[PDB]
Amino acid sequence: EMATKADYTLDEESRARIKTRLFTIRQEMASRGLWDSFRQSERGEETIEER
Amino acid sequence: GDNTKWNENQNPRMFLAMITYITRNQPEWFRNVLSIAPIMFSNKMARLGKG
RNA sequence: AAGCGAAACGCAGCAGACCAGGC
Numbered sequence: 001e002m003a004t005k006a007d008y009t010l011d012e013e014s015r016a017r018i019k020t021r022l023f024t025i026r027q028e029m030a031s032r033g034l035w036d037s038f039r040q041s042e043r044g045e046e047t048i049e050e051r
Numbered sequence: 052g053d054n055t056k057w058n059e060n061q062n063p064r065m066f067l068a069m070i071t072y073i074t075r076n077q078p079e080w081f082r083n084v085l086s087i088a089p090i091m092f093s094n095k096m097a098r099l100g101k102g
Numbered sequence: 103a104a105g106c107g108a109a110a111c112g113c114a115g116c117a118g119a120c121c122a123g124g125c
């Protein structure tokens with residue numbers, strides 16, 4: 001985690017909880033083999049006009 | 052001078068023809084949305100009224 | 103001058119032989 005002026009505004013327990021959640025999400029996603037797809041980003045394609 | 056029976060003689064099919072000619076080269080959705088009105092008016096039914 | 107509905111995202115090498123060829 002990185003915070004402006006190195007001021008995270010929160011106690012270490014709250015940030016540790018949020019990081020844990022993020023990790024849990026990471027492992028849950030990796031278990032289904034979708035992490036590599038998510039890795040690549042910059043998704044921006046649209047075509048729908050009017051039908 | 053005015054034109055006698057103006058509304059009684061302006062056929063909606065003529066407006067459909069004019070809309071189709073005006074909307075030449077335009078996107079098909081634009082032609083459809085513009086031409087729907089004359090189509091419905093050509094099939095219009097007049098309610099007789101109070102009685 | 104004009105005027106209308108007045109979030110989040112640019113790889114990588116063997117190396118060392120031996121042969122043929124170039125001016």
Ligand SMILES: [Mg+2]
Nearest residue numbers: 122123124125
């Ligand atoms: Mg030479």
